[PDB]
Amino acid sequence: DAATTQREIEKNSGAWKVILVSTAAFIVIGAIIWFGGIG
Amino acid sequence: DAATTQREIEKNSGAWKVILVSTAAFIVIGAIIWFGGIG
Amino acid sequence: DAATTQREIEKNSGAWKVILVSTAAFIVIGAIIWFGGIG
Amino acid sequence: IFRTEEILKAAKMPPEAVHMSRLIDAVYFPILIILLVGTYHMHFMLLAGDWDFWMDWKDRQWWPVVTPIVGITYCSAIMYYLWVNYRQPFGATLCVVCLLIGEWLTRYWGFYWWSHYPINFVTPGIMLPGALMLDFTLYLTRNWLVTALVGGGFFGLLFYPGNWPIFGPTHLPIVVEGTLLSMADYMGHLYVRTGTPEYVRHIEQGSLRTFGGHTTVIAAFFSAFVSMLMFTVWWYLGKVYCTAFFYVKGKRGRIVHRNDVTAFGEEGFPEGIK
Amino acid sequence: IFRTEEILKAAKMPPEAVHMSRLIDAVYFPILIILLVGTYHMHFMLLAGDWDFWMDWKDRQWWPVVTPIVGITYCSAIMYYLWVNYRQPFGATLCVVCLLIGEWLTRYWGFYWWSHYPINFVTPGIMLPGALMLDFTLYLTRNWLVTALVGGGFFGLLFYPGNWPIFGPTHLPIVVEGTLLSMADYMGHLYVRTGTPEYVRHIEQGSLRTFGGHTTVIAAFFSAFVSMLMFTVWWYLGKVYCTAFFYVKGKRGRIVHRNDVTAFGEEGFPEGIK
Amino acid sequence: IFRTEEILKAAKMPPEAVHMSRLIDAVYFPILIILLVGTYHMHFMLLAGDWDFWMDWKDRQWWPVVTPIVGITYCSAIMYYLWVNYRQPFGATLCVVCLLIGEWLTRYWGFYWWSHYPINFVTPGIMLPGALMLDFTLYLTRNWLVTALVGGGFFGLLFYPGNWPIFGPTHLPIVVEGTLLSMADYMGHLYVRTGTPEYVRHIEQGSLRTFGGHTTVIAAFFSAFVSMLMFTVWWYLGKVYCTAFFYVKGKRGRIVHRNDVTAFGEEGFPEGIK
Amino acid sequence: YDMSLWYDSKFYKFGMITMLLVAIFWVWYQRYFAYSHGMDSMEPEFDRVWMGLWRVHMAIMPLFALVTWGWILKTRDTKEQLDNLDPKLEIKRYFYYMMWLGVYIFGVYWGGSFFTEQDASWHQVIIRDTSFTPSHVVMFYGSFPMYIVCGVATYLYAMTRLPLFSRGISFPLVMAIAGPLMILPNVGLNEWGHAFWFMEELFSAPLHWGFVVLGWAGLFQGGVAAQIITRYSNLTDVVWNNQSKEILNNRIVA
Amino acid sequence: YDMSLWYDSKFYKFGMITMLLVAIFWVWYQRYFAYSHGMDSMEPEFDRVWMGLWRVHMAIMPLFALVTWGWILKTRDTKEQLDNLDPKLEIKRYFYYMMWLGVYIFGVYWGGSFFTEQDASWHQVIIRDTSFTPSHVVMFYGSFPMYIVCGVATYLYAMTRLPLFSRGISFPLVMAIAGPLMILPNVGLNEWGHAFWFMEELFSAPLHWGFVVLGWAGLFQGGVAAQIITRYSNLTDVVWNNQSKEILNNRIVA
Amino acid sequence: YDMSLWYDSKFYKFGMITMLLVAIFWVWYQRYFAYSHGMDSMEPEFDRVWMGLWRVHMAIMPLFALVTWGWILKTRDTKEQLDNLDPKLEIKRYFYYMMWLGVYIFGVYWGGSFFTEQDASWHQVIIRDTSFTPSHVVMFYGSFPMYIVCGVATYLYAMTRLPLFSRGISFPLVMAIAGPLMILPNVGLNEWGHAFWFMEELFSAPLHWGFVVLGWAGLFQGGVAAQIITRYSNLTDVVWNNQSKEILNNRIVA
Numbered sequence A, B, C: 001d002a003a004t005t006q007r008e009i010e011k012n013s014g015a016w017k018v019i020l021v022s023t024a025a026f027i028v029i030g031a032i033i034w035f036g037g038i039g
Numbered sequence D, E, F: 001i002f003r004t005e006e007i008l009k010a011a012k013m014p015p016e017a018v019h020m021s022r023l024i025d026a027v028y029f030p031i032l033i034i035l036l037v038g039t040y041h042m043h044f045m046l047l048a049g050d051w052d053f054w055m056d057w058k059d060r061q062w063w064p065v066v067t068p069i070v071g072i073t074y075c076s077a078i079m080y081y082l083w084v085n086y087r088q089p090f091g092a093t094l095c096v097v098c099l100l101i102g103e104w105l106t107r108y109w110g111f112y113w114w115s116h117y118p119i120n121f122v123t124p125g126i127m128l129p130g131a132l133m134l135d136f137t138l139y140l141t142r143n144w145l146v147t148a149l150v151g152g153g154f155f156g157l158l159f160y161p162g163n164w165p166i167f168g169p170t171h172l173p174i175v176v177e178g179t180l181l182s183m184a185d186y187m188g189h190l191y192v193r194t195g196t197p198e199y200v201r202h203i204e205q206g207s208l209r210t211f212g213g214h215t216t217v218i219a220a221f222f223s224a225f226v227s228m229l230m231f232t233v234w235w236y237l238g239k240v241y242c243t244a245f246f247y248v249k250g251k252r253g254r255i256v257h258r259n260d261v262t263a264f265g266e267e268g269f270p271e272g273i274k
Numbered sequence G, H, I: 001y002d003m004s005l006w007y008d009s010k011f012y013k014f015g016m017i018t019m020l021l022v023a024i025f026w027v028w029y030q031r032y033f034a035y036s037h038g039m040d041s042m043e044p045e046f047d048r049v050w051m052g053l054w055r056v057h058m059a060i061m062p063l064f065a066l067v068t069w070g071w072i073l074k075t076r077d078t079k080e081q082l083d084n085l086d087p088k089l090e091i092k093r094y095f096y097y098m099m100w101l102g103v104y105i106f107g108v109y110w111g112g113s114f115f116t117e118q119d120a121s122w123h124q125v126i127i128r129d130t131s132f133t134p135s136h137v138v139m140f141y142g143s144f145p146m147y148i149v150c151g152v153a154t155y156l157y158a159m160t161r162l163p164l165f166s167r168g169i170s171f172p173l174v175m176a177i178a179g180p181l182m183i184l185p186n187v188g189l190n191e192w193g194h195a196f197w198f199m200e201e202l203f204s205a206p207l208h209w210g211f212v213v214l215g216w217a218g219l220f221q222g223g224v225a226a227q228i229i230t231r232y233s234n235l236t237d238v239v240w241n242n243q244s245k246e247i248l249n250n251r252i253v254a
């Protein structure tokens, strides 16, 4: 159909950014934890 | 039917007496045993 | 049929000789082993 | 105030049928309660009753491990029965309540009023918060595997913190003849047990591989882990316990398994009732 | 004088078929006897043969408990086979008779005529009254669960009284070097066993929790109780031992279990024979 | 050069389907390799890894018995999977190769480059000839019971002769402080193991019932015998591991096991493709 | 509507009160004769009191079994009467069967729960466990056979008055009863373990684990109740919803 | 022909390289902080380094689970879209499901094989096993939850994007994932055995046999792959052999 | 009527007498060479006598297996001859199969019963068990392989001359033979237990319990005889009751 090509072209670009905003954060949130000595 | 009402009216009065002649005896047979020291 | 009577008359005489040539040999091969001390 | 009239209308029960159903409930439910009391009490006392009886057996290694593993067994099976057959979420709580009723009856009449032991020395005590949380997990998740995991974790973890208010004060130190004891230990020595000497206590003893500050915590997790297994196993045992068939026979004398089926549960039976 | 002609007429067997059936019986029954001798003898000797071999191993704790539990196993399975397949009640008696035949053959040829031990020192002895009573219970009750209960009780209880006439005289006291011994003990010491020293005897030793006057009685009941279980278990094992199917295959190469059925046992086959 | 075009023509695969199948193989086979590495490595190290780690644990009693029994388990199941599903005879060899790859990776990175132990002290070593001969037996016989017998015998027997070239030179005698040691023993003492003292070695110790000249030989046969059992058992476990069904539900909410079937494997499907 | 046509509870109440009174009498006997005549097993007074009670149990319980089982088997329903059974009478008979189950379960509660922790309680005021200790007499020789009789009687009634139970064999019910039944022969294991090297100090000892495995059979109440509820639903459909009687005779045929 | 319509591997490659880099970072952290700050568990530097890494794991891994599971469950296919799914897209989605399985199995390899013999290696250079030893932090608190997230995510994707997995419950897949999943709670058994009389000296000790029994569930890959291959053959028949689509919807119905 | 058309017993009698004579010869050899040359395992006469007998067994028994199995497999019936088999000849062949079973069971009796208590008898006149003790040679290396050959030969004959056995795989027969067959490899367990810490003093020791578990497979004679009796009844119906032959070829098809 078309909604297939489009719903799936939207989850390619959607999935490749929940990957790149989690890569960055998870490395920044764990340093803030490592370098801050929380606990 | 009728034999149902009667066969079952006969086991009500029949069962309530095998209960009252066993209550009495079992208490009299076990005393005769308790107070007689049989054995 | 006939091949039944004959295939089976041939395995009677065939089986009674693989019995009598193994009886003899097995007793001769194990003596040659017993009396020769092979090993 | 719940939705009972809708349930009764969906079941297509005339008022006499509703009254007959109410009588069935009022007859069967006490029977199930008494059976749970008896059988669960026997199972618990003959698998974990020794730590249950005495105050000085409640330790950091064996009591909080043995008790939940033994307790989860009947709870899982009764929860399976109730949930699968009638969609009732109060299985584990009912099991533990029955166990505690039986335990209190025997402690008051057997240990105290016959054997002259004090009541405070024989507090069992409770295992109820874990059963309640397991029931809540089963109701909220509706999945018995997620229930196995989370509820078994809860059951194995909440045992010691839930019993600490009862047996925490019994750990206050006392000095007798220049020797340090826990108050539970001195209570155990004070009240003579002719059949139970000291050396039979299966309690912690310390080890060179042991972290004394973490003992209970480790015992809190191990007892949890096995619980997650035990639940699952006994859940399948529930399917064994609900096996209801008859050995019917005919002709050659052959025996066949036969199942009696509910007519109301068939495809078109409810529509043809009217 | 029994009802054999009626049975043969109900089976619809021509005289040549009757003769062929008689030949089948005369060929197969000795084969079953020899198989029972061999396998039952191996099982009994490798599970309970040590108490069986020697007079001084026949004690009040282990012999009358181990022997019936080991003996009931083959008896239950063979009784299942015979009763279920052919309605023959002589299973346990046949098993014990085969075991005793094998035992006597080996004791005479192995222990006595080769190892120079006296025959009286190696009496096994009997386990036959319990098997006979079990067979009678199975025939009279026709129910295998009531048979399990009552016959297992009989099998576990009658072992010691049935063997007492054989080994009772061996318990007469003797005094050797100022030490009291049972005559079985002195027989064991007299005839040297290079491979069997004294300390390997798994016999009673007494305990501070033991009532010496009741020992055998307790051993008579425990051995009974387990028997009631063992029978039942091995009865189900009989159903495993009668599993008779073929792995047939076709086309994709798929293997399916296939059962060969008796045509005479079908619904209308006997009526169409004529 | 084998017969691949005939196989592809019999499967009725268009060229795009052939390319898609090749991509499936190239994706799935490394996944299976990595899974075998991980799981088989965990199983082997946590059942028989202690004799695997150190040179002085490789003895005549426990190493050549424990190692093949542990190793045959995954091999039998993976061979079942491959042979039954795809007619592929390289199961056991693949398992042992994956185990050795994982072992070498961990020994180089964990034991040597992190814990500073020498590489020669942590040779595992090989278990490959037995797996190869088991694969050859399975391919040549095509029967999994004859394969069980012969291949389990080979697997249990060829372990020690196949490892002797690696650990034979380590048995040369040395004299330290007037005491005789094997060179493996002195290597074990030389390189300190803070967590592994001497007394934890489960190695031969000699016995008064022991024939020192036959020890390994006996260990070569026992390990074989159990292997013949283990294979068989795990072969059935393979059928458990290939169980592929779905819990489907409908209407009353009833759950039924459902199997997805291959359409190409039906009776007339291949003929109707054209 | 008429309650009495499908419900009656006099026998259930009588059995419940009688069992409670018997248990109370056992408790009073234990509290009156244990410390004064039950401490030493070799004293003549120990015989006269506790072995006398044991003999009373050994003579009364077989009489109880005989009377109950004979009455149940004697007033039996023929196959003709079980084929044209009035479904209202069938509802009443299923209520009776549930009440028999309740009496049996009350006996199991008395045997396995109350008179068992009371035994552990006795095991700690005595040097060592005997065989006819005050506790044993009341349960091992009293409570144990008591529930067993009720169990048999329960099944008996069902497979005599309930056509379904007279037709097929209620698998769950079998185990539900056989369990506590087989618990009594486990006293042999208990004694053999206590007297020999299976140790005696713990009450939760491995030799006491035969009782738990045999009492796990009491959890087949799930299958028992499933059968009861299925039959109750079928009877409700037949009697009140004017449905065909064929649902009562269709699924338990050969 | 067009490869891209039924095959894509970017996500698989990214996950593989990311997992490899995470494992390499764990190895470097162990080799840099174990001998200098991991020898004594009571030192403040031990806290600041290894318990800091433990806290980082405890804060990141739940975030990983939340993000992955929420994204998978949020971009879900409705029952309408899963009923008229393009079979070429179904082939692509099955490739994606196999790649999710591959990532999960790579995590299992890192947890159970590499970072386990590295632990035995650590068990011999230390006096006794602790609880947050350098090794533990990287695997027990790092590798273990890591593969578990991937496992759930794998199943999640399948039962969200694969109609068959959204229809029936892939029995083999369940066990394949539940196994290594249940391996993490077995750390409780490990610690309880080490700290008490189950001994600690051997690495192949009976308390370490919970992991092997739980990882035997990873052998249900046979059933998983059987389902995958059956569906792949059906899709090949439908797409390229011009066969009827009814073979895709016939055998997994009620 | 004609007995010879469906019954013959010459081979059975010959095998029985030959096995009995072989056992008698083994007994005579044991009684003549055990006390004088079997006491010490390091003496040259021990070699020349008992290891010579062991070598004779090791050379003769494989020859026995080869000859018997090759003759059975060489004079095989083709699928054509097994499809139009004369049912009287089928009765005769089933009698032959029962006789092969009888020879196999006689071998099992010699191995497991007679030459086993004779071994316990030898275990008490010697210091400790060896490996080629007089007893072992006759059974472990003689009686054991002997019955195994007969077992294979029995099945061989059946699945070569009996169409049913050539069609499907007689599950019970498989176990009935495999059991005593697998008993011979259990000699490895026996030796390993004797030589190491599994103790040797008792004959009813746990290491001797492999033989009982493997010989429990000999109880599948129930299934074997069930198959034999079912086929015998079908043949009786076909031959003498003039019933259709279709009952012989209906139930063991794909």
Ligand SMILES: [Cu+2]
Pocket: G119, G123, G129
């Ligand atoms: Cu007691």
Ligand SMILES: [Cu+2]
Pocket: H119, H123, H129
């Ligand atoms: Cu560790």
Ligand SMILES: [Cu+2]
Pocket: I119, I123, I129
């Ligand atoms: Cu021997």
